[PDB]
């Protein structure tokens, strides 16, 4: 039996800002714009899927 | 090696009668029990 397990890390960290200062991607934002503003789970499930 | 080997003879006379017999039963046995078992392991861990 042999096991090898290995990692290399090249970006020690990235830290994204908190949600106040994050800029949304235009497509994701444009999708949020069309969310039905009511609990129609069919839409939100599409968002969570994508 | 094991051996059982026996020779009997007899004559009797009165007329005459005789008997002679030889038996030799034998066994030989050998066993050889050769065997080997090598084993090993290596851990290595590096950071």
UniProtKB/Swiss-Prot annotation, chain A:
Domain of life where this protein originates: Eukaryota
UniProt disease link: Complement component 7 deficiency: A rare defect of the complement classical pathway associated with susceptibility to severe recurrent infections, predominantly by Neisseria gonorrhoeae or Neisseria meningitidis.
Lineage: Eukaryota, Metazoa, Chordata, Craniata, Vertebrata
Bilayer-spanning residue ranges: none
Compartments in which it is found: Secreted; Target cell membrane
Description of post-translational modifications: C-, N- and O-glycosylated. O-glycosylated with core 1 or possibly core 8 glycans.
Protein name: Complement component C7
Subunit text: Monomer or dimer; as a C5b-7 complex it can also form multimeric rosettes. Component of the membrane attack complex (MAC), composed of complement C5b, C6, C7, C8A, C8B, C8G and multiple copies of the pore-forming subunit C9.
Coiled coil: none
Organism whose genome encodes this protein: Homo sapiens (Human)
Gene behind the chain: C7
Assigned protein family: Belongs to the complement C6/C7/C8/C9 family.
Function: Component of the membrane attack complex (MAC), a multiprotein complex activated by the complement cascade, which inserts into a target cell membrane and forms a pore, leading to target cell membrane rupture and cell lysis. The MAC is initiated by proteolytic cleavage of C5 into complement C5b in response to the classical, alternative, lectin and GZMK complement pathways. The complement pathways consist in a cascade of proteins that leads to phagocytosis and breakdown of pathogens and signaling that strengthens the adaptive immune system. C7 serves as a membrane anchor.
Portion of the full-length sequence here: 249 to 298 of 843
Curated annotation (Swiss-Prot), chain B:
PTM note: All cysteine residues are assumed to be cross-linked to one another. Individual modules containing an even number of conserved cysteine residues are supposed to have disulfide linkages only within the same module.
TM segment ranges: 8-19
Disulfide bonds: 5-24
Cell compartments where the protein resides: Secreted; Target cell membrane
Subunit record text: Component of the membrane attack complex (MAC), composed of complement C5b, C6, C7, C8A, C8B, C8G and multiple copies of the pore-forming subunit C9.
Job of this protein: Component of the membrane attack complex (MAC), a multiprotein complex activated by the complement cascade, which inserts into a target cell membrane and forms a pore, leading to target cell membrane rupture and cell lysis. The MAC is initiated by proteolytic cleavage of C5 into complement C5b in response to the classical, alternative, lectin and GZMK complement pathways. The complement pathways consist in a cascade of proteins that leads to phagocytosis and breakdown of pathogens and signaling that strengthens the adaptive immune system.
Protein family: Belongs to the complement C6/C7/C8/C9 family.
Disease: Complement component 6 deficiency: A rare defect of the complement classical pathway associated with susceptibility to severe recurrent infections, predominantly by Neisseria gonorrhoeae or Neisseria meningitidis.
Protein name: Complement component C6
Source organism of this protein record: Homo sapiens
